[PDB]
Paper text:
Overcoming lysogenization defect (OLD) proteins constitute a family of uncharacterized nucleases present in bacteria, archaea, and some viruses. These enzymes contain an N-terminal ATPase domain and a C-terminal Toprim domain common amongst replication, recombination, and repair proteins. Here we identify and define two classes of OLD proteins based on differences in gene neighborhood and amino acid sequence conservation and present the crystal structures of the catalytic C-terminal regions from the Burkholderia pseudomallei and Xanthamonas campestris p.v. campestris Class 2 OLD proteins at 2.24 Å and 1.86 Å resolution respectively. The structures reveal a two-domain architecture containing a Toprim domain with altered architecture and a unique helical domain.
Crystals of the analogous BpCTR construct diffracted to a slightly lower resolution (2.2–2.3 Å) but produced a more complete structural model (residues 390–594). BpCTR contains two domains: a Toprim domain (residues 390–504, purple) and a unique helical domain (residues 505–594, yellow) consisting of a five-helix orthogonal bundle and an additional C-terminal amphipathic helix (α6H). α6H extends into a groove along one face of the Toprim's central β-sheet, forming extensive hydrophobic interactions. BpCTR crystallized in a different space group thereby permitting the helical domain to rotate and scrunch closer to the Toprim domain. Consequently, T506 and E508 shift 1.2 and 1.5 Å toward the active site respectively, which facilitates the binding of two magnesium ions in a geometry consistent with two metal catalysis. Each magnesium is octahedrally coordinated with a water molecule bridging the two metals where the scissile phosphate would normally sit. The metals are spaced 4.9 Å apart, suggesting they may move closer together once DNA is engaged. The conserved Toprim glutamate (E400) and the first aspartate of the DxD motif (D455) each provide a ligand to the first magnesium (metal A). E508, located in αH1 of the helical domain, directly coordinates the second magnesium (metal B), while E404 and T506 stabilize additional metal B waters. We also identify a conserved lysine residue in α5H (K562) that extends toward the active site, separated from metal A by 5.5 Å and from metal B by 3.8 Å. Mutant combinations of either the metal A or the metal B interacting residues together completely abolish Bp OLD nuclease activity on linear DNA substrates in vitro.
Author numbering:
A (entry chain B), D (entry chain B): 391 to 594
B (entry chain A), C (entry chain A): 391 to 481, 488 to 594
The structure:
Amino acid sequence: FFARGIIFVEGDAERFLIPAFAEALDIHLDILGISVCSVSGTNFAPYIKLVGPTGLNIPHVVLTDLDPVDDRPPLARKRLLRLLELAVTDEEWDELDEDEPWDLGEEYGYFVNDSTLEPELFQAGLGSGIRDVIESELSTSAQTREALACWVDDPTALNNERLLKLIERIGKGRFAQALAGFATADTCPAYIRNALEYIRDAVA
Amino acid sequence: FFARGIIFVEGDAERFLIPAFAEALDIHLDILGISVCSVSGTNFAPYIKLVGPTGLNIPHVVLTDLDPVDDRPPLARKRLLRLLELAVTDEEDEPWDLGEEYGYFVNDSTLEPELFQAGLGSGIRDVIESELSTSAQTREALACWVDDPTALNNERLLKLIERIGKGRFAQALAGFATADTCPAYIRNALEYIRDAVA
Amino acid sequence: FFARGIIFVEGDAERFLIPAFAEALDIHLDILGISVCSVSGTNFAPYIKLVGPTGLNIPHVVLTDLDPVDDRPPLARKRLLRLLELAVTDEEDEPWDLGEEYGYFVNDSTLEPELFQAGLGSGIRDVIESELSTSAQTREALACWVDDPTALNNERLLKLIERIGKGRFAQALAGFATADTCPAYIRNALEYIRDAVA
Amino acid sequence: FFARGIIFVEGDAERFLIPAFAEALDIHLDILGISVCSVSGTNFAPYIKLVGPTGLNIPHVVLTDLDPVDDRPPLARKRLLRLLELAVTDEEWDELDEDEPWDLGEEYGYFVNDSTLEPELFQAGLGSGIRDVIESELSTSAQTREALACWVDDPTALNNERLLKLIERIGKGRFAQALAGFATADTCPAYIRNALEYIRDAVA
Ligand SMILES: [Mg+2]
Ligand SMILES: [Mg+2]
Ligand SMILES: [Mg+2]
Ligand SMILES: [Mg+2]
Ligand SMILES: [Mg+2]
Ligand SMILES: [Mg+2]
Ligand SMILES: [Mg+2]
Ligand SMILES: [Mg+2]
Ligand SMILES: [Mg+2]
Ligand SMILES: [Mg+2]
Ligand SMILES: [Mg+2]
Ligand SMILES: [Mg+2]
């Protein structure tokens, strides 16, 4: 490392896609010395310590999935309180029932989506490209292709878990490398765009 | 397991500078799926075998330094012939333009004089003066080099650069990358590998 | 997340040669949990802050080159003072022996002349002659350097080594590592970090 | 890479332990230019192609777990036939009902243990050190400590899956880094020693 800035992401899907969207947005990560570091999981806290104010004091952002669970809080709320514990001033406000630490997280460069990466891509308008990739990569049934056509016509009808099943057949990392070809500024999910603008400005 | 194209480079400086110049030229390596691969030396031949026609037939380019030698042919001559032997059709001051046809690009000296000739001399001086503690003498040497790039003393520049580390130096210098300071041989290799992947 | 000790080195050559010399001295870095960490340059100070008393207080050593300069103090002087400032108790041609007390080891020139002085000259010549295409003149230069290490021409050795790549060169040279060709400053740093981890 | 030789292993446990046993055995991997490469899984076939006779032709070995399953063949038998397909001359013998491809695998540098790494370490005589590490790292019950004392007195009584549960509480990679301190030539499992001698000789 010893980048001028770091984008911490969960996996290799993000590692392919984030630099592709940055290119689409004309945000120059290589000129600015910004690196994308996958933690191969959801445990950013060891990296935050090493890199945060106590450590090397390197500008950084975190991109992570909300991971909503049925009849339970989103997995990301607790994972975000842990990162905030290592980075926030010792005032300890309510954070809106401490289940709304999101806004304070964004001030510190921690960005959470509304579900998980691949449904967010579909909802951000990449549905046609995701369908192209899945039908080029997999051997598919007519039932699958028609489910994908329907989701493209109405992304609100999208079944997230059947989508990820399809993608896990491809491999999330291989899927994302193929989807990177389709990145445009208008199909970048908001949380990725926010994080790229944040880290560009932190470094500059 | 696969990339749409590969840019082969010699070392850490190109690893950091080629992606910066690609951004300054608006060439989207990550969207095109083009990666930059350093061979940490000057022997590209094993890699060209893996990914060339012999093997995976992945589109690729090579960036290498001429390495001109006093009273000898420059070192890149035999280096290119060796790569051409493994890539070309049936048929030295000869192989340069044929090499470029196959994505093999040689500069006219070595990376760092080329950057000075291309207009990055002010950036190189800024990087060196802000990262190192320097004597007035080296700072005046750098001022001469900027106002006349032909005056460049390469033993001295490289010693300065090795104090920083070639990769650290290049990462700092990337922040000054622009389209008008991109050496021709890098710009041509980048346009070539973008055309190729298309 | 943690190692029992760290050996900080400047670059790729030490990355490959320090573990080879440790094997030739029967110092078991993997059993002791000691890792070798290259800083890719000459600025050790940020790392010493992370792992020194200021931070994790992991036992560590530093291997760095003197970098002697004509009509100046050698570059390592200020470099060591900067690291000593961050490591030492309250109180230049001074700081060397105090530096060694804290695991900071400086050679007398730079790695590669030191290897020649220590007896590895025949290996360096073998590596260079078998990996490069060479002129008779460079092969006679290497023969002079082997029979008299004081005659060594460092501009020329380094140019040869950069044709190979410093890390490739050092990995090939590792195969010749022995206890009797290990420079003193490497041997002392290795014994020091083994004592420290115990 | 571009090592003179490669030891392909499954995970980071092996990545810590193999070089420790090599030191204990006075097999000089750094002098010989031999590297230990974790594939973070059990899928060596992509690496074998890149590195084998068709690829860079680099001397290499594979260390992998038998992975015995109850009422089923060992998982390693099929995983080994796949690697052998990419490396063996096209004679295609019986391999002893093709469920005994082990001997031919060892000729090609593919070494399989009898269960999985951590029980094999216990059985090779490291049981006392494994007990030390577990009781230093974990908070343990008296029931656990007495089960470990019993296994140390008679490794044949060892319960493999309770051992790995204990170790998975520590983290297999962190466990192995701590166990490396205990490596000796006499506690090296045979399959690791065989592989180290093979790759040392292939390189020399
Ligand atoms: Mg880019
Ligand atoms: Mg996730
Ligand atoms: Mg648009
Ligand atoms: Mg642009
Ligand atoms: Mg060069
Ligand atoms: Mg260079
Ligand atoms: Mg020994
Ligand atoms: Mg040096
Ligand atoms: Mg050196
Ligand atoms: Mg060793
Ligand atoms: Mg296993
Ligand atoms: Mg013994």
